[PDB]
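The material for today's practical consists of a large collection of protein records. There is nothing in a record beyond a sequence line and a structure line. Backbone structure tokens are a discrete shorthand for how the chain folds in space. Nothing more is needed to start thinking about how sequence determines fold. As an example, a complete record with its sequence and its structure tokens follows.
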Amino acid sequence: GSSGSSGYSVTVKWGKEKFEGVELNTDEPPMVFKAQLFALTGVQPARQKVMVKGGTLKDDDWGNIKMKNGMTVLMMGSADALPEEPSAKTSGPSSG
């Protein structure tokens, strides 16, 4: 994607896992923000129940949602998959 001005910063909370300083955009669909969480948590952008201050994140479109930079995003889901060898650099999952 290119051009456009609409990017917010929220905090993704995934159980024990924590993510502060995530790149979120409103100009685009909520599927994107969830597309990232996938690389942040490891759960699909669908199974990833992205909660809201007082609602749930849509998929088709936000819908002029009242977003803000600094808030907190709660996520709920698990990445069901076989216990395959870990393949990551810098940091690792460990959990296995």
Remarks:
- The chain has one helix and five strands.
